[PDB]
mmCIF file of C-alpha atoms in Angstrom:
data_model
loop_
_atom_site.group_PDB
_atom_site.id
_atom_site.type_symbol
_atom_site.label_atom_id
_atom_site.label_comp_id
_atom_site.label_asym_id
_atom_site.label_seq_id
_atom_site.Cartn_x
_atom_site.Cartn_y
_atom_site.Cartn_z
ATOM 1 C CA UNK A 11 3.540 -2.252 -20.027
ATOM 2 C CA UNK A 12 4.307 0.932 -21.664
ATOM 3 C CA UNK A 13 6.521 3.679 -20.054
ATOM 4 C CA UNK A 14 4.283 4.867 -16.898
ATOM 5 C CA UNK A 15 6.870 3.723 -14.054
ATOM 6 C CA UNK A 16 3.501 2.584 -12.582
ATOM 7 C CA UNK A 17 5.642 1.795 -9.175
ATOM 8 C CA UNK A 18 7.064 5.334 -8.798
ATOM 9 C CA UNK A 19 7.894 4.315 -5.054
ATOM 10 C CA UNK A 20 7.230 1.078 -3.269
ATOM 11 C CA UNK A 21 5.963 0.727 -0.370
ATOM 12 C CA UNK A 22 8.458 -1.692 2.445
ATOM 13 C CA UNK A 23 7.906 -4.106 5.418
ATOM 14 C CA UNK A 24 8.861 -3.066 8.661
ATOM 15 C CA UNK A 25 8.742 -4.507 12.253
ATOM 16 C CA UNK A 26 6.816 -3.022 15.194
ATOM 17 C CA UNK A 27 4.988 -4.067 18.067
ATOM 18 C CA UNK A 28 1.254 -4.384 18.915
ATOM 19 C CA UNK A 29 0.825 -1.098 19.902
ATOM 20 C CA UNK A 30 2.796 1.335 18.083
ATOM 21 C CA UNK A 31 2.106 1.822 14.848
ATOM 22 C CA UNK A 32 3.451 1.056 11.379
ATOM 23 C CA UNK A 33 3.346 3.252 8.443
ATOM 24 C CA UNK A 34 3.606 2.620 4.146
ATOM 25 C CA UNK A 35 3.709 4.937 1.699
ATOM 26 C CA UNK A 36 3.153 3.724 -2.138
ATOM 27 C CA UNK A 37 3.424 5.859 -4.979
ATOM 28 C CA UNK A 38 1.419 5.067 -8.094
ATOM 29 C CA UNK A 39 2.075 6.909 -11.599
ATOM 30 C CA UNK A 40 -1.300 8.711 -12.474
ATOM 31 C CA UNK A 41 0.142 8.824 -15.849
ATOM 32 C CA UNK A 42 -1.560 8.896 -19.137
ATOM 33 C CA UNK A 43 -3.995 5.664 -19.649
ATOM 34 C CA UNK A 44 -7.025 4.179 -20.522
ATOM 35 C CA UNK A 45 -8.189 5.353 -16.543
ATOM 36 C CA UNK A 46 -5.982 6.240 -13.782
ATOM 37 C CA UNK A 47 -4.082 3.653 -12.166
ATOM 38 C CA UNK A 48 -6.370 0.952 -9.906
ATOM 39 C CA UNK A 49 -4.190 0.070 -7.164
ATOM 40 C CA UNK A 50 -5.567 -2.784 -4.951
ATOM 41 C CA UNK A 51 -3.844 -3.096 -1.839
ATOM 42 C CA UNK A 52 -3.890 -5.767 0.437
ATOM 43 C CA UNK A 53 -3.211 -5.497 3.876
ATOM 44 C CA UNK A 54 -1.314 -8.090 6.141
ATOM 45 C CA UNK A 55 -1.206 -11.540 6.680
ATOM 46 C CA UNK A 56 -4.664 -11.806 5.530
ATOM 47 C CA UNK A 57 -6.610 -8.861 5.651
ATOM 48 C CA UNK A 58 -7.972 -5.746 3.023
ATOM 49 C CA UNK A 59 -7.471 -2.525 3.545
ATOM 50 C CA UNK A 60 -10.706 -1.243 1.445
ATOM 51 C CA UNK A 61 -12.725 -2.315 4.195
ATOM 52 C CA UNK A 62 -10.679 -1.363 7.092
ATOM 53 C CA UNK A 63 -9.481 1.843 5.833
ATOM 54 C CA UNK A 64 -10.476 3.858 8.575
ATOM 55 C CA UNK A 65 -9.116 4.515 11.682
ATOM 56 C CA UNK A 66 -6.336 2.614 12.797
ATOM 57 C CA UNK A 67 -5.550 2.104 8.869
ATOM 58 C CA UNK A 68 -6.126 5.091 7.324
ATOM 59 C CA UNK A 69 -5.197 3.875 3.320
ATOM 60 C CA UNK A 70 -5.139 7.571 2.326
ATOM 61 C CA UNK A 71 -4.638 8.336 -1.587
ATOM 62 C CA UNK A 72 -2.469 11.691 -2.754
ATOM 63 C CA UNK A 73 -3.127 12.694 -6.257
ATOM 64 C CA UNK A 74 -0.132 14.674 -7.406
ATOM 65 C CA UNK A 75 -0.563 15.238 -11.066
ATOM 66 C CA UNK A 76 2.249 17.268 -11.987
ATOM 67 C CA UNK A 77 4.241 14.287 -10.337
ATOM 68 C CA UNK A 78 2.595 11.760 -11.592
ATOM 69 C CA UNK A 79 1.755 9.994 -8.386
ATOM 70 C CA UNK A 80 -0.982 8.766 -6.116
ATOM 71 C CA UNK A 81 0.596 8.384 -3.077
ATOM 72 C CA UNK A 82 -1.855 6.155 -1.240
ATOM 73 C CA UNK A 83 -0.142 6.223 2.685
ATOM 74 C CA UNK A 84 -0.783 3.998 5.091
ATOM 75 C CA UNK A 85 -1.211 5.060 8.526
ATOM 76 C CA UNK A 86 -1.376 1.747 9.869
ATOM 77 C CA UNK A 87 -1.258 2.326 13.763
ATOM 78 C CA UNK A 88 -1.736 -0.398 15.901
ATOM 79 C CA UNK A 89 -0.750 -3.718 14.754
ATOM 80 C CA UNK A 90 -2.196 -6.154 16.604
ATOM 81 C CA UNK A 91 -0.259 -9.396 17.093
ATOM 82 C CA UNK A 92 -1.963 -11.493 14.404
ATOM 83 C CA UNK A 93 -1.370 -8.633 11.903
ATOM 84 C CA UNK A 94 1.808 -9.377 10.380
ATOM 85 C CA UNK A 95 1.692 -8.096 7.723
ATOM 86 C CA UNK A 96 1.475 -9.261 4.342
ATOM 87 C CA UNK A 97 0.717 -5.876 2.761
ATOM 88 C CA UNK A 98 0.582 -6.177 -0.896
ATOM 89 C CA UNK A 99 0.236 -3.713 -3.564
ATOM 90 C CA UNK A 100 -0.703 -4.363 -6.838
ATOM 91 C CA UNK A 101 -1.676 -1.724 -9.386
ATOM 92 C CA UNK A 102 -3.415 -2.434 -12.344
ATOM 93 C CA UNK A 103 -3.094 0.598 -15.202
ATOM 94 C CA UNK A 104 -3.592 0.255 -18.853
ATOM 95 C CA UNK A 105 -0.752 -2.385 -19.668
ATOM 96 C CA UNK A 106 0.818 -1.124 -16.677
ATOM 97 C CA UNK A 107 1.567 -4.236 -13.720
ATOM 98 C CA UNK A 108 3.554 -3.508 -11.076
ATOM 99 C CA UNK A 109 3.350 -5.179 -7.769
ATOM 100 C CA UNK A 110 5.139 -4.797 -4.059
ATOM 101 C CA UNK A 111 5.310 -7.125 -1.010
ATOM 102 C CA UNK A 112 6.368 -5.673 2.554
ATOM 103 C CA UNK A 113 5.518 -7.228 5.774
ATOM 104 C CA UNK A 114 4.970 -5.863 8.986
ATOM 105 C CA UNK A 115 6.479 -8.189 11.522
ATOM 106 C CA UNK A 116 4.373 -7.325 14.587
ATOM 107 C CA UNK A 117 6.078 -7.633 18.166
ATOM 108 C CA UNK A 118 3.874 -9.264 20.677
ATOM 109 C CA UNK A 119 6.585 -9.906 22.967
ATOM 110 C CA UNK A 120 9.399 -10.736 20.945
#
């Protein structure tokens, strides 16, 4: 892993309730490479975002050169009870690994 800083800004967990919302933010060095960074996210406690991606999880991508970042947000609204979150983001660059794990502790009731 050469000097990309390929995690500019990780993404956290957070706890909210089935009906609210939750919200990530990850910040990916489009550095130099081979190709720019592949960040694979993976959404909570079991799930993808690629597929999802959408409407109540909107995995949006920035592309700030001149910072160096893809800032992919999350606009993760509406966690359902059975959501909690295991959101993990992995980006794959070059020689590049970096890697986050933030959960999203879903409030049915309690």
């Amino acid at each position: 892993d050469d000097p990309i800083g390929l995690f500019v800004m990780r993404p956290q967990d957070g706890e909210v309730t089935v009906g609210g919302s939750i919200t990530f933010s990850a910040r990916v060095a489009g550095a130099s490479l081979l190709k720019p960074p592949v960040v694979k996210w993976f959404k909570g406690k079991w799930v993808d975002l690629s597929s999802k991606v959408g409407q109540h999880l909107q995995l949006h991508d920035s592309y700030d050169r001149a910072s160096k970042v893809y800032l992919f947000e999350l606009h993760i609204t509406d966690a359902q009870p059975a959501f909690t979150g295991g959101y993990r983001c992995e980006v794959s660059t070059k020689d590049k690994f970096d890697c986050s794990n933030f959960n999203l502790t879903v409030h049915e009731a309690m």
